[PDB]
């Protein structure tokens, strides 16, 4: 559940205790538009998994979460690493521990939706786009 | 929550009371491989929405479900209609009431993963594949 990955030491956790203001700040640094904090809070309590990287010298520096039906499917959302800490393998390690936690829970199929600029990053983790022509689709997206 | 769509009368419901054996039979008729009934049961209890079509003259004839983080995302899974009842607009109406229920709950982005043979069916409902080059990805899929 709580594990040191690096040594300042970077700690992984799947406790899911994220302060919504800390997450907002982290989303600001990576240039994300703000979303209502009560909604962020709702999304955290109702995610199947909330996985965090913290920097204790505790500062939140990464997050990934997933939705799931606890059986067949889990979809990963909102993966981000503090840009001051990128390039050090911390995103790659966050995702690995997320995938492994979901496999540990026997979830048959792990899914995500990837921006074009970050598709190769997911390929290198074992994700595969449009398997056998399956298409990811959104309802009237505004991106 | 419970609504008549057609008149035998076809009833829509979002109660989520699905007997796992009824669902297994319905999956058999559309030619789906079986999955462990305890897992199906788990997937039903832990879906954000379980939507059913029944034929009362009660026989289960359609289902759709979704996962969700109750805020920003909902992904639709396991949409099926009894093949004896296909072509009568019942799948199209099941999906509409699913989308509308999710919008009623203020979910920002509605997602699904579509087989190639059924992508146009979802387009005609307002879904859009690979918006701005986003790619749906699975982890080591075996399809």
Question: Which labels suit this protein?
Answer:
homodimer; 143 residues; alpha+beta; Aminopeptidase; 6-stranded mixed sheet; 4 helices; 8 strands; 36% strand; transferase; N-acetyltransferase; dimeric; Serotonin N-acetyltransferase 1, chloroplastic; EC 2.3.1.87,2.3.1.-
Helix-strand layout with pairing:
The structure is a homodimer of 143-residue chains.
Chain A: E1 2-6, E2 9-13, H1 20-29, H2 37-45, E3 49-56, E4 59-68, E5 73-81, H3 90-104, E6 109-114, H4 119-123, E7 127-129, E8 135-139
Parallel strand pairs in A: 5-6
Antiparallel strand pairs in A: 1-2, 2-3, 3-4, 4-5
Could you explain how this protein is built, in words?
Two copies of one chain form a homodimer. Chain A has 143 residues and is of the alpha+beta class. Chain A has one domain (2-133): 3-Layer(aba) Sandwich (Aminopeptidase), CATH 3.40.630.30. Helices cover 27% and strands 36% of the residues of chain A. Chain A has four helices and eight strands; from the N terminus they run ββααβββαβαββ. Chain A has helices at residues 20-29, 37-45, 90-104, 119-123, and strands at residues 2-6, 9-13, 49-56, 59-68, 73-81, 109-114, 127-129, 135-139. Chain A is globular, with a radius of gyration of 15 Å. Chain A starts with a strand and ends with a strand. The interface between A and B is large, with 48 and 48 residues. Strand 7 of chain A pairs antiparallel with strand 8 (135-139) of chain B. Chains A, B: It is an enzyme of class 2 (transferase). Chains A, B: It comes from Oryza sativa subsp. japonica (Rice). Chains A, B: GO terms for molecular function: aralkylamine N-acetyltransferase activity; L-lysine N-acetyltransferase activity, acting on acetyl phosphate as donor; N-acetyltransferase activity.
């Amino acid at each position: 559940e709580e594990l040191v990955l690096l040594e300042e030491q970077i700690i992984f956790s799947s406790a899911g205790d994220v302060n919504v203001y800390d997450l907002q700040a982290l989303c600001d640094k990576v240039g994300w538009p703000r979303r209502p904090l009560t909604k962020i809070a709702a999304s955290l309590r109702n995610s199947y998994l909330v996985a965090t990287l913290h920097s204790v010298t505790k500062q939140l520096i990464g997050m990934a979460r997933a939705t799931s039906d606890h059986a067949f499917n889990a979809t990963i959302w909102d993966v981000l690493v503090d840009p001051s800490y990128q390039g050090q393998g911390l995103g790659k390690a966050l995702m690995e521990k997320v995938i492994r936690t979901l496999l540990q829970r026997d979830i048959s199929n792990i899914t995500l939706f990837a921006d074009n600029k970050v598709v190769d990053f997911y390929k290198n983790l074992g994700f595969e786009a449009d398997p056998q022509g399956i298409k990811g689709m959104f309802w009237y997206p505004r991106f």
